[PDB]
Design a protein around this motif. Structure first.
Motif, mmCIF file in Angstrom:
data_model
loop_
_atom_site.group_PDB
_atom_site.id
_atom_site.type_symbol
_atom_site.label_atom_id
_atom_site.label_comp_id
_atom_site.label_asym_id
_atom_site.label_seq_id
_atom_site.Cartn_x
_atom_site.Cartn_y
_atom_site.Cartn_z
ATOM 1 N N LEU A 113 85.129 -81.537 -43.299
ATOM 2 C CA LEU A 113 85.454 -80.165 -42.927
ATOM 3 C C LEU A 113 84.758 -79.742 -41.636
ATOM 4 N N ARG A 114 83.531 -80.223 -41.416
ATOM 5 C CA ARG A 114 82.752 -79.794 -40.257
ATOM 6 C C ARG A 114 83.398 -80.192 -38.935
ATOM 7 N N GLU A 161 85.837 -77.496 -54.496
ATOM 8 C CA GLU A 161 85.170 -77.440 -53.199
ATOM 9 C C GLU A 161 85.914 -78.331 -52.218
ATOM 10 N N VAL A 162 86.481 -77.733 -51.171
ATOM 11 C CA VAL A 162 87.128 -78.539 -50.146
ATOM 12 C C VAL A 162 86.061 -79.318 -49.386
ATOM 13 N N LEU A 163 86.288 -80.621 -49.241
ATOM 14 C CA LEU A 163 85.423 -81.517 -48.484
ATOM 15 C C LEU A 163 85.990 -81.860 -47.123
ATOM 16 N N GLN A 221 89.599 -82.001 -51.777
ATOM 17 C CA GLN A 221 88.735 -81.163 -52.597
ATOM 18 C C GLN A 221 88.040 -81.980 -53.682
ATOM 19 N N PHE A 238 92.804 -71.160 -41.178
ATOM 20 C CA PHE A 238 91.918 -70.559 -42.161
ATOM 21 C C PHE A 238 91.790 -69.047 -41.979
ATOM 22 N N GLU A 277 86.201 -67.897 -44.060
ATOM 23 C CA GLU A 277 85.398 -69.099 -43.899
ATOM 24 C C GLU A 277 86.324 -70.308 -43.855
ATOM 25 N N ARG A 278 85.923 -71.322 -43.077
ATOM 26 C CA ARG A 278 86.787 -72.472 -42.818
ATOM 27 C C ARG A 278 87.142 -73.222 -44.103
ATOM 28 N N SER A 279 86.351 -73.050 -45.167
ATOM 29 C CA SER A 279 86.738 -73.584 -46.467
ATOM 30 C C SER A 279 88.052 -72.976 -46.956
ATOM 31 N N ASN A 280 88.367 -71.746 -46.532
ATOM 32 C CA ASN A 280 89.545 -71.027 -47.016
ATOM 33 C C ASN A 280 90.736 -71.335 -46.113
#
Lengths: 151, 150, 150, 151
Positions: free
Chosen positions: C25-26, C134-136, C121, C56, C59-62
């Motif tokens: 994700l980073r 949790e998205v990875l 995830q 997104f 937050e970039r997770s979303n």
């Protein structure tokens, strides 16, 4: 395609294509990148040869028939030309160009290294290594039935 | 499952040629150098989904450059900048290869290079004039991989 | 040459997971839904070379949608249409998959589907609250093929 | 994630997520697509439940602790609710929703089909088939040490 350099026994040539008028400055970059001092044309005039001479390399328009062998006059003019220019400036290079460099012009180069000592099969396989499919039947016939002179 | 299919493709890379998987010249999507990158033209280029588009001048056999969609990054539609100009602002190598070239060799050129596309040309010995290279098609890395994984 | 490398990759499709080849994700290149598709923003999107870009919100997770570059086909920069609107004009399926998923299975989903991309995830059993996905990362078809042909 | 339907012995539930206010019309499309007439909420209010009731399905806000088991009062209210609504309208469906549907809400559904006859391992493996990783340790403890009543 693209230009190719051929060297045998201090002889060096550049089999090349017919440029357009806009490509011609990059063209002269490539002509000097192999150190060619004279260029001989076998196709028909699609540009003007005064700047190429202003950059130092003389232009000779010797057209003969497309897809056909050169006459014996063009052959002797050609051999005398390689003699004169290669003892005027050894190690230099003279360029020949067809439309793409896949027939008449390679035939001339062929006669040059065949008069220069290299055999028939060795020369033809030497040229088509450097650009694939260089000769057609009407020109295979000539290069096959040509008689050398050790000139 | 997948594995035996992909294996079989990998082995057939040695025998199949670039000529077998290319999209022939008639069906390649292409753009002429005299295109005027105004609003509608650029929109039509983008909406096609192609990331890179061969650019020809005159007849479609005469392929002269590659237009990447990213190359249109900051072009103004109101200025109607011809396509050949943009073509001149960006360097995209233009590989050519012969119909003979096996698929593994093409694959390894693709792996090395920066261009993932190649013009497929043949040579014809049959003519009342000098031999000439005849473009037949275009092969991409996606054609090769499409042929590995079916 | 190529063949034994590609064969080895094809066999390792069964053991390697989506977690091994994903871009985490980073490092994924991503765009926020509140982007304003003005001249500079659209130019920056195009110049990136990516054909599709995750979108997104917050937050970039979303991760909520996918912006294909072609989706910008006829957008006017002078109008500053927000990105979420364009997002709403086009349907691009949004696959999610678990870190467990082997590479051959992912490959076959890729072969079927219309989307060539998937969010990676995981599930965490460790919490003073309810379990959550949790998205990875993100895995693409290109990651999988990059892993076959090295 | 996405909603899931669970059916056992005329009982049918929809384990679902907490929507936002803009998603809620497509949400009610999905609520009626499985024919749910009542929805019971375990998370905290992030929207308003007057339109969902104007579309015909009653909303019950019974929040308890996140990540934790339900108290016995919530359990009995819940069982009496499934009884009342499933003999009011058999074959219908009642929805429960956590934040994503991965803890408290599946625990409630779990107690429903565990009181409905299905065993503990069969129910847990029935739910995590339908959505992977559904329960955490604090809730495994409850569902394990829960005593059925054949209600």
């Amino acid at each position: 395609p693209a230009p190719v350099e051929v060297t045998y026994k201090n002889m060096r040539f550049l089999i090349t294509h017919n440029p357009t008028n806009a490509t011609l400055n990059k063209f002269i970059e490539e002509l000097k990148k192999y150190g060619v001092t004279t260029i001989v044309r076998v196709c028909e005039a699609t540009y003007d040869t005064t700047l190429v001479e202003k950059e130092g390399i003389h232009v000779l328009d010797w057209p003969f028939d497309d897809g056909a062998p050169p006459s014996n006059q063009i052959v002797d003019d050609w051999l005398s030309l390689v003699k004169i220019k290669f003892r005027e400036e050894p190690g230099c290079c003279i360029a020949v160009h067809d439309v793409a460099g896949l027939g008449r012009a390679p035939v001339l180069v062929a006669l040059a290294l065949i008069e220069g000592g290299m055999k028939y099969e060795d020369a033809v396989q030497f040229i088509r290594q450097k650009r694939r499919g260089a000769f057609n039947s009407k020109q295979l016939l000539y290069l096959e039935k040509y008689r050398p002179k050790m000139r | 499952s997948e594995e035996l299919n992909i294996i079989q493709g990998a082995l057939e890379l040695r025998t199949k040629t670039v000529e077998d998987v290319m999209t022939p010249l008639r069906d390649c999507f292409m753009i002429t150098g005299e295109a005027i990158l105004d609003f509608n033209t650029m929109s039509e280029i983008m909406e096609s989904g192609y990331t890179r588009i061969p650019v020809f001048e005159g007849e479609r056999s005469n392929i002269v450059d590659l237009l990447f969609v990213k190359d249109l990054a900051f072009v103004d539609p109101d200025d109607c900048t011809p396509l050949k100009t943009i073509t001149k602002f960006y360097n995209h190598p233009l590989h050519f290869v012969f119909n003979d070239t096996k698929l593994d060799a093409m694959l390894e050129e693709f792996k090395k290079g920066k261009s993932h596309l190649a013009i497929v040309q043949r040579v014809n010995n049959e003519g009342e004039g000098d031999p000439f290279y005849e473009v037949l098609g275009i092969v991409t890395l996606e054609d090769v991989i499409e042929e590995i994984i079916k």
